[PDB]
Amino acid sequence: KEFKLSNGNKIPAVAFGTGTKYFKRGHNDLDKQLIGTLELALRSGFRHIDGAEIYGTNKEIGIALKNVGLNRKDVFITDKYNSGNHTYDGKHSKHQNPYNALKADLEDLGLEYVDLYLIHFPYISEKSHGFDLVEAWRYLERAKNEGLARNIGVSNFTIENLKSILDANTDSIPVVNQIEFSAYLQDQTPGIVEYSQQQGILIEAYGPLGPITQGRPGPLDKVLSKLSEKYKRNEGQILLRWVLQRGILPITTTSKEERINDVLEIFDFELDKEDEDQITKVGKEKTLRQFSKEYSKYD
Numbered sequence: 001k002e003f004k005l006s007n008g009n010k011i012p013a014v015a016f017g018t019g020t021k022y023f024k025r026g027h028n029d030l031d032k033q034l035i036g037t038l039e040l041a042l043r044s045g046f047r048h049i050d051g052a053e054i055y056g057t058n059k060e061i062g063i064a065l066k067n068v069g070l071n072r073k074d075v076f077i078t079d080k081y082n083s084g085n086h087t088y089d090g091k092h093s094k095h096q097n098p099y100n101a102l103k104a105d106l107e108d109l110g111l112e113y114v115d116l117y118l119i120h121f122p123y124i125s126e127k128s129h130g131f132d133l134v135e136a137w138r139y140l141e142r143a144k145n146e147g148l149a150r151n152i153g154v155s156n157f158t159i160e161n162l163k164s165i166l167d168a169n170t171d172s173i174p175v176v177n178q179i180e181f182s183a184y185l186q187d188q189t190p191g192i193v194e195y196s197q198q199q200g201i202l203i204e205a206y207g208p209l210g211p212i213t214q215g216r217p218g219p220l221d222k223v224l225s226k227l228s229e230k231y232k233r234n235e236g237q238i239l240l241r242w243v244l245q246r247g248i249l250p251i252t253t254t255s256k257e258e259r260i261n262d263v264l265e266i267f268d269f270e271l272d273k274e275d276e277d278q279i280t281k282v283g284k285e286k287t288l289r290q291f292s293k294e295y296s297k298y299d
């Protein structure tokens with residue numbers, strides 16, 4: 001039920017997300033349904049919630065955590081610095097740097113620390129932020145040494161984006177690179193999963209159900225239909241299990257109770273190597289990219 005990070009710290013192997021579906025669009029009101037669903041998820045056995053400054057859902061996470069009252073050490077919380085989009089237009093975190101942003105978010109969360117803190121997107125430059133990408137990492141390093149983030153990482157980084165940090169003289173290296181990853185998207189940017197895995201950086205996969213949520217009709221429908229019958233598992237479940245068997249941590253979300261339990265049952269079964277391999281092969285027949293579409297030139 002968990003992965004082990006580079007530094008030996010454990011991370012629960014499925015996460016409940018609070019972006020996409022729940023991402024606030026021109027309001028800051030509490031999302032009461034979300035808080036409800038977070039409670040249900042935690043009480044059902046989720047122990048890893050994926051959040052971000054830009055989502056506007058960090059308050060909800062903190063309320064749900066307080067209402068459930070799990071031991072703090074048993075829960076794994078991710079937050080992310082709103083670094084901005086690929087235009088470097090300056091539309092990003094309202095705080096002066098990632099360290100001050102994480103501090104403000106911790107107040108929204110009602111927590112002493114997050115378990116993982118990420119640079120959300122790799123578009124940081126002095127002209128747009130007052131600091132460059134490696135100094136943003138340095139802020140993350142201050143947060144880590146201070147105790148404000150147990151682990152630090154990145155998101156939506158290419159290999160060259162990773163090299164900016166690894167090649168600098170730094171205290172530590174990212175332990176996670178959270179990217180879009182699904183059977184229809186096996187490499188968000190070229191060689192990223194393979195390069196990261198070889199360096200010991202854990203890949204977390206968001207948008208893992210793309211094939212099913214936005215990818216129908218496509219070449220996986222026939223394959224998933226057959227394995228659903230054979231495993232007595234639904235297609236969402238097969239896809240997520242398959243992500244796990246690639247050594248990747250899937251991040252999903254839902255507003256439906258029955259799906260909370262579907263997701264948590266991905267650890268009660270195994271796909272035969274041959275069936276895993278057919279998903280990976282047939283996956284490659286179609287390309288589906290839902291996020292970070294500046295990367296679409298690679299498709």
Ligand SMILES: NC(=O)C1=CN([C@@H]2O[C@H](COP(=O)(O)OP(=O)(O)OC[C@H]3O[C@@H](n4cnc5c(N)ncnc54)[C@H](OP(=O)(O)O)[C@@H]3O)[C@@H](O)[C@H]2O)C=CC1
Nearest residue numbers: 017018019020050206207208209210236251252253254255
């Ligand atoms: N770092 C980054 O740039 C990004 C990070 N993320 C993180 O990852 C999280 C998850 O991403 P998302 O893309 O939503 O994840 P998924 O790929 O897992 O899609 C989840 C969606 O699938 C639906 N769903 C679940 N099961 C089925 C089913 N079998 N058939 C059809 N639909 C189904 C859910 O709808 P329903 O509610 O109706 O069940 C939900 O809306 C985000 O909330 C966010 O926290 C996401 C995007 C970018």
